[PDB]
Amino acid sequence: MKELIYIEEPSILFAHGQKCTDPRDGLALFGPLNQIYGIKSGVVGTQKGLQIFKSYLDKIQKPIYNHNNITRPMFPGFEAVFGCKWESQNIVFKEITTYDLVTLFNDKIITANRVDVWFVIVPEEDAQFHDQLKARLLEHTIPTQILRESTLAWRDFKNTFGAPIRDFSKIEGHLAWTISTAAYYKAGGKPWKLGDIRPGVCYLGLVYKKIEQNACCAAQMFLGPWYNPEKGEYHLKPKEAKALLTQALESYKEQNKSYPKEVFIHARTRFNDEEWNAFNEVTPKNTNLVGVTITKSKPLKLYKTEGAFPIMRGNAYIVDEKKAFLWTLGFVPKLQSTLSMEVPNPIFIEINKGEAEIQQVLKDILALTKLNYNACIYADGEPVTLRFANKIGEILTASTPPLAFKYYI
Amino acid sequence: RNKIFISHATPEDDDFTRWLSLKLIGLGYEVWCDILFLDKFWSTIEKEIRENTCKFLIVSSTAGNKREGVLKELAVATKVKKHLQDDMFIIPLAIDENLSYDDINIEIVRLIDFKKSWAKGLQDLLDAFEKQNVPKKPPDHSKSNLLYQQIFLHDKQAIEKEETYDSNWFPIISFPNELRFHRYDWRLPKQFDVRTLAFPAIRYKEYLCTFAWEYDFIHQLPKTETYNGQESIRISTSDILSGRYDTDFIRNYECQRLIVQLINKAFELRMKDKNVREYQMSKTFAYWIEKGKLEKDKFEKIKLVGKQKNKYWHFGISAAGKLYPSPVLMVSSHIIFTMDGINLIKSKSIQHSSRRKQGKNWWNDKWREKLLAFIRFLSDDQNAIYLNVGSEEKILISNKPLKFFGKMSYVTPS
DNA sequence: TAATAGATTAGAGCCGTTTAT
RNA sequence: AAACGGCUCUAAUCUAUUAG
Ligand SMILES: [Mg+2]
């Protein structure tokens, strides 16, 4: 019988220097870590879309509950949480009526650009519209939240049966929480950070996006986008890896006034020896560079024998000194439920390159699962490194990008 | 005195009461609420409302409008209000828009609303507290966090519980002693499909890599006879799995890859003789039981096939052999849908939608029991599944999956 | 060039909204 | 594209071998 190790759940800091483990609970209790004093909304869409967004804004001012208010924390209201007003009376609207629709919304945005975040209300009546719109707004550095009309007014859009196509009745409070957190983060306020951030460790998410031949994208997490298209392999050329690591190290040195004592590169792909020697030839001697590959849906399923509820999140199977399984999903005791449906898929974390303690690596990944600012969730299945790297990479491949994540998420 | 009392509908008004109480404690107010205690109580309540309370709060919701405990606390608070001659001792907290005018309690109506917004209501409550001489301490959100952790998360922590887990991985109990490369130079046709052989076999170089003895493919390949077994290359399977065998003939990683391919092909061939049906997944073959092939569609009290509306779901499994941590078989679980239990639904969209619908309410216990029941249904003997890699050679897959245990767990929700 | 695997990888949809009350 | 998962599907690549 293999012994499981348990990773203690990381805490996330909020306002007044208060740390808890649930972004929703901490936001409702202490308030956002960074306090902005208002959100001026810019709405791009039709009159029906503007009315839908205004109605949703009036609704989200009031408290919104979920079907399960113990499993999913309910929404007290935007001002009751974030201490600032995001109302429909502070709205500037650009009336409307794939590349041409992107141009329509993009022009309607940049002609006016003082809003905090531009809300693109998408009529239901284009698989590249979001990424392209987001990409051509990068050079003009607009923080934008795209909201489908079938999300803010999900009841009003039904199939021929009459039931809503997107059933958000059970997660209405969670939907309000996530939309509020996205708007607040895009308006300039970080709602939480890691409660405990190791000093001198730099976290890099290195993903590859297939341009429709693969573009490598690195996102640095400051507790920093990089891009380069290349051939059809998920590996970095010597000069390419050198440039990536040098840019990441210099960004960290600019932010923290010193080089990291450890650098962890998070990837969904293994690192070959060539790109890792390129990485090592540019890192400082006193900086320990570790290559961590995190794969999803590797066919392991630990089933809790006794009960009907799954393996608790934070349990980790240490296969090797370099390879392990981490349950970033599973039962959350604080939520009294599971972050995933059915049985959770553990993420397989390999220390492919470099030397590091596997327990510390899994602790860092569990901590980084908390910084998903694109979602107001208890924790993410994957660390914010890989998630945000993938978001900004798919955004950049749509065609110097800004370093703030609110322009991609 | 200094205490702040909030009276609320305990079963249903907990969200607002918790938010308001912890917010006020974060603001330095000495808040007394029924939700701020563990293992509690009316004598203590009436005592806090009668003597300790400075300001008395009531969540004026429709559910809390007419409640025994709320009304009792309102009565004792009215007694204290008359005793102290404070015109605003009892402060209604109108939070429910459903509670209509002239429908609230008679005492309450003639007496701050949170219906429009909780921040506006909290600000009005705060400014009312400042207009009167309501005592407060400097804002200490540290004690609000402490109370939240100590009470609201008291039963929602990870405890030092010894927990045991079943896994997806079923150990390979044993392998055939020798992996054999049979040099069927011309006796194996160049265009012959080795996948159609009776036993798993891989063309590897000028040989056939298999666990089968050199004359096992006699029926499929008549020319296999009169083949000398001396030219066959025999490698200890333990050497391959331990990494000991590395030779110019075949690399160790390639040998393990060939062994895994043999394991997968042997499982595929065994499901043919396991009276089970197959379903072509994207990258593998899931294996599901028809309706009527199991007694009451159950194997050892675990339902492996059932009904979903006008459809039939069947718990299917797909197996991939692996050797890295230990020689195991990873068994992914699926739900495979049929029109009547025997006839597969051709459209993959309906299959996927039905899979989502069926897995809605399938949780740890259901997936675990169905996986174990299906694997034991494929069991040949008591604790093993036989994969016939040869006439006299077998690969044994453990009936019981790999067992895990952790020193941390949770109290199961009830 | 094509095929057979095993391994890695990515990308697209699609459905449910995390077992209680 | 609020979002996160669970699944399904389609591909690509690297190996190793074989047929050209
Ligand atoms: Mg977003």
Side-chain angles (χ1 to χ4, degrees):
Chain A
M1 192 139 87
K2 286 109 164 37
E3 199 150 338
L4 283 197
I5 77 157
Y6 175 71
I7 311 291
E8 197 199 272
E9 175 75 1
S11 41
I12 38 185
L13 189 88
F14 294 96
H16 320 115
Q18 297 308 318
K19 308 175 200 272
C20 90
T21 70
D22 198 335
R24 293 80 59 90
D25 270 27
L27 276 176
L29 286 165
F30 323 116
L33 162 86
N34 297 0
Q35 188 54 72
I36 76 207
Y37 317 109
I39 298 195
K40 209 220 162 71
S41 304
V43 182
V44 193
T46 61
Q47 300 279 21
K48 206 211 144 157
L50 167 77
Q51 276 333 117
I52 280 161
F53 183 77
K54 275 186 161 286
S55 317
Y56 189 76
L57 260 194
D58 321 326
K59 141 158 199 83
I60 174 186
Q61 304 314 305
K62 300 127 47 203
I64 299 153
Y65 289 89
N66 307 279
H67 179 231
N68 201 325
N69 292 309
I70 313 85
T71 278
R72 330 198 73 124
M74 68 102 210
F75 192 53
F78 186 87
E79 196 176 35
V81 172
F82 297 102
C84 75
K85 296 251 226 282
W86 172 30
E87 324 205 276
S88 44
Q89 291 57 240
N90 207 21
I91 273 186
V92 288
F93 175 55
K94 344 294 307 183
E95 159 82 347
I96 291 183
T97 307
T98 308
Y99 186 104
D100 48 18
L101 189 76
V102 166
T103 327
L104 186 74
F105 285 86
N106 219 82
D107 274 341
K108 288 260 160 15
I109 289 160
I110 46 56
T111 51
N113 181 338
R114 206 98 201 100
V115 324
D116 283 71
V117 46
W118 279 94
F119 289 93
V120 169
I121 313 299
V122 160
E124 264 285 350
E125 61 278 7
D126 294 346
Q128 268 279 315
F129 166 53
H130 157 89
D131 299 315
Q132 174 164 54
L133 175 37
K134 245 65 185 5
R136 330 199 324 209
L137 282 197
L138 284 191
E139 90 255 24
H140 304 126
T141 206
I142 297 97
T144 284
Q145 172 64 61
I146 289 126
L147 294 170
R148 312 201 74 141
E149 274 169 24
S150 43
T151 294
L152 315 188
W154 59 266
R155 303 187 155 83
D156 307 10
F157 309 75
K158 317 142 154 303
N159 38 33
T160 194
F161 195 14
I165 296 164
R166 325 193 28 185
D167 196 49
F168 298 155
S169 38
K170 285 189 250 162
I171 47 152
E172 246 183 3
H174 159 74
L175 161 69
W177 260 117
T178 303
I179 280 184
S180 293
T181 310
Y184 193 89
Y185 185 75
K186 292 165 169 62
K190 213 160 92 204
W192 63 85
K193 45 133 74 95
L194 274 190
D196 147 297
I197 309 143
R198 318 172 36 203
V201 181
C202 171
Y203 295 101
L204 213 47
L206 205 146
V207 307
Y208 292 81
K209 313 286 314 196
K210 284 193 125 35
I211 331 178
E212 279 286 83
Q213 273 158 341
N214 309 324
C216 174
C217 160
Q220 184 173 167
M221 318 273 129
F222 295 100
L223 326 166
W226 185 76
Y227 172 48
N228 273 49
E230 40 156 310
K231 276 74 49 164
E233 80 159 3
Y234 310 126
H235 287 294
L236 279 177
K237 273 297 137 215
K239 92 163 260 282
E240 213 177 11
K242 286 191 204 283
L244 177 150
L245 224 235
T246 278
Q247 149 154 358
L249 285 161
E250 295 306 326
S251 280
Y252 190 97
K253 184 139 152 214
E254 276 147 28
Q255 167 83 116
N256 306 83
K257 294 179 179 179
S258 180
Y259 274 135
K261 205 223 91 53
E262 285 134 65
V263 173
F264 288 81
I265 313 202
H266 290 185
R268 328 194 183 264
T269 76
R270 284 129 83 251
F271 308 95
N272 68 16
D273 271 317
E274 200 206 26
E275 92 179 76
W276 196 252
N277 307 335
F279 276 155
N280 273 338
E281 272 164 294
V282 293
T283 182
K285 52 99 163 152
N286 247 347
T287 291
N288 170 48
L289 177 59
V290 180
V292 168
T293 76
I294 309 138
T295 35
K296 295 206 145 213
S297 284
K298 218 150 155 283
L300 178 55
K301 287 248 167 159
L302 256 57
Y303 306 98
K304 222 189 60 176
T305 78
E306 220 157 301
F309 283 75
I311 171 160
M312 163 180 55
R313 154 178 164 99
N315 278 295
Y317 173 37
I318 299 287
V319 186
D320 254 5
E321 286 286 59
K322 277 157 191 347
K323 282 140 142 273
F325 284 93
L326 181 58
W327 270 266
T328 48
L329 308 138
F331 190 87
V332 166
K334 178 261 162 273
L335 281 197
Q336 281 292 285
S337 99
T338 315
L339 282 187
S340 69
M341 72 223 281
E342 318 175 345
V343 180
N345 310 312
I347 51 173
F348 187 67
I349 285 130
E350 181 197 334
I351 300 163
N352 197 234
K353 291 305 177 311
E355 292 278 278
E357 284 250 17
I358 185 61
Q359 323 234 339
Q360 184 57 254
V361 171
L362 309 180
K363 190 207 209 123
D364 288 355
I365 279 145
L366 208 72
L368 292 159
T369 50
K370 303 303 259 143
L371 298 314
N372 192 8
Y373 299 122
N374 192 215
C376 200
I377 42 158
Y378 177 87
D380 210 272
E382 39 162 15
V384 72
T385 57
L386 281 188
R387 157 91 67 206
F388 275 31
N390 185 68
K391 283 270 137 273
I392 88 166
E394 67 170 71
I395 272 294
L396 277 177
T397 53
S399 212
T400 287
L403 65 167
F405 293 126
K406 53 163 175 188
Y407 306 119
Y408 301 91
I409 64 149
Chain B
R1 189 183 175 173
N2 44 49
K3 210 96 45 162
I4 292 270
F5 201 108
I6 300 102
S7 145
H8 62 285
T10 305
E12 54 267 355
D13 269 331
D14 279 343
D15 279 315
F16 168 81
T17 317
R18 149 212 83 76
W19 172 86
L20 172 92
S21 318
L22 285 175
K23 228 79 179 312
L24 285 175
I25 302 208
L27 295 165
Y29 288 103
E30 182 93 50
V31 152
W32 200 104
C33 212
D34 284 344
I35 57 188
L36 300 187
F37 300 98
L38 303 177
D39 266 282
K40 30 170 167 273
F41 185 63
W42 165 252
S43 71
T44 278
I45 290 162
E46 146 264 319
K47 167 57 213 201
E48 309 280 317
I49 325 204
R50 294 183 181 277
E51 258 58 84
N52 290 331
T53 285
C54 146
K55 283 282 153 317
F56 174 83
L57 299 173
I58 48 185
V59 188
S60 144
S61 57
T62 315
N65 202 15
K66 332 188 195 252
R67 165 153 289 71
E68 192 47 73
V70 183
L71 266 44
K72 210 194 217 75
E73 288 153 358
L74 189 40
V76 54
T78 297
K79 206 144 197 130
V80 192
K81 182 186 59 215
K82 291 251 182 23
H83 181 285
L84 297 170
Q85 276 107 34
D86 182 15
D87 78 306
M88 220 195 164
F89 173 83
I90 292 170
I91 317 189
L93 268 40
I95 66 136
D96 189 9
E97 230 156 40
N98 291 15
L99 196 47
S100 64
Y101 68 119
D102 285 344
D103 269 14
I104 320 149
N105 211 334
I106 297 167
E107 286 127 16
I108 283 148
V109 179
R110 294 182 184 173
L111 294 169
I112 302 134
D113 79 318
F114 295 64
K115 299 175 293 161
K116 274 311 208 103
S117 165
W118 282 5
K120 297 175 180 179
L122 175 62
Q123 201 28 68
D124 307 347
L125 180 62
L126 271 206
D127 72 37
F129 280 178
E130 311 308 341
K131 288 174 182 177
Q132 309 117 57
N133 180 21
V134 179
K136 76 187 282 284
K137 302 222 217 213
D140 202 347
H141 300 73
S142 101
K143 77 165 300 188
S144 172
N145 196 19
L146 173 73
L147 215 46
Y148 162 78
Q149 283 143 3
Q150 256 182 355
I151 275 73
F152 301 78
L153 302 195
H154 150 268
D155 38 354
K156 305 176 170 168
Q157 294 306 9
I159 76 188
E160 322 89 86
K161 179 161 127 160
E162 220 283 286
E163 184 72 52
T164 299
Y165 311 86
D166 291 345
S167 44
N168 236 36
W169 300 358
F170 297 78
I172 298 162
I173 302 172
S174 63
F175 292 85
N177 275 309
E178 305 280 284
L179 171 61
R180 312 140 178 282
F181 296 75
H182 300 314
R183 212 192 217 261
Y184 307 140
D185 212 85
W186 48 267
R187 331 167 158 75
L188 171 62
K190 300 270 206 31
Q191 259 54 260
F192 188 88
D193 189 16
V194 291
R195 287 178 305 174
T196 60
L197 283 172
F199 305 114
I202 328 296
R203 283 173 183 267
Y204 180 64
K205 303 182 155 170
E206 25 276 348
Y207 303 79
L208 199 55
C209 163
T210 189
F211 292 110
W213 143 69
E214 49 266 356
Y215 306 115
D216 264 3
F217 315 105
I218 273 280
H219 183 257
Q220 301 242 5
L221 307 166
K223 267 167 280 159
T224 296
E225 43 195 73
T226 73
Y227 157 79
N228 192 5
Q230 270 327 84
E231 50 190 325
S232 288
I233 287 162
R234 307 196 152 69
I235 312 176
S236 150
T237 309
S238 79
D239 277 18
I240 297 156
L241 308 170
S242 77
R244 179 169 317 72
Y245 181 94
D246 207 318
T247 291
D248 165 74
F249 171 55
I250 179 167
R251 274 300 154 282
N252 180 240
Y253 81 98
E254 188 49 43
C255 224
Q256 297 199 353
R257 200 193 69 76
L258 283 198
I259 280 198
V260 159
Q261 196 186 338
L262 286 180
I263 291 160
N264 293 6
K265 192 45 181 172
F267 192 82
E268 267 198 37
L269 290 179
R270 196 52 173 130
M271 314 309 299
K272 290 308 143 311
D273 325 285
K274 236 71 194 73
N275 75 21
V276 78
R277 284 275 298 281
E278 84 194 331
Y279 176 72
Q280 175 70 254
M281 303 264 321
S282 209
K283 278 154 300 262
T284 189
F285 261 118
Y287 299 105
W288 56 280
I289 299 161
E290 281 169 332
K291 170 206 179 213
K293 298 270 139 305
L294 276 183
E295 188 61 44
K296 260 146 297 290
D297 288 342
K298 284 223 181 57
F299 176 84
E300 289 174 358
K301 304 140 164 237
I302 312 292
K303 214 187 179 201
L304 288 188
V305 7
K307 274 198 70 28
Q308 158 165 330
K309 220 80 78 152
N310 73 348
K311 259 163 289 97
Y312 274 82
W313 65 261
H314 314 269
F315 181 82
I317 70 143
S318 82
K322 298 283 159 65
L323 308 167
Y324 158 57
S326 44
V328 293
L329 195 80
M330 299 165 176
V331 179
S332 290
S333 299
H334 325 276
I335 318 174
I336 291 136
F337 281 79
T338 48
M339 310 142 31
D340 41 36
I342 300 119
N343 290 296
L344 269 170
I345 289 144
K346 295 326 172 253
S347 65
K348 283 159 185 281
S349 65
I350 284 167
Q351 280 264 347
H352 166 83
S353 95
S354 329
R355 155 73 181 90
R356 294 334 291 162
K357 290 184 37 60
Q358 193 58 39
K360 284 180 18 180
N361 309 312
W362 283 20
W363 298 105
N364 174 76
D365 64 311
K366 222 134 210 163
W367 287 108
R368 177 193 164 278
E369 66 165 47
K370 261 161 232 288
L371 177 101
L372 298 198
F374 202 102
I375 289 294
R376 276 177 342 248
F377 167 81
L378 313 173
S379 183
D380 289 85
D381 81 87
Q382 214 51 245
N383 48 22
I385 311 178
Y386 300 161
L387 312 178
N388 313 121
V389 277
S391 69
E392 289 116 8
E393 307 277 74
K394 281 168 327 160
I395 284 181
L396 309 195
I397 309 312
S398 207
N399 253 350
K400 335 312 305 173
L402 279 175
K403 302 284 314 202
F404 294 76
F405 75 100
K407 302 294 199 223
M408 287 282 126
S409 203
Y410 51 94
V411 180
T412 309
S414 298

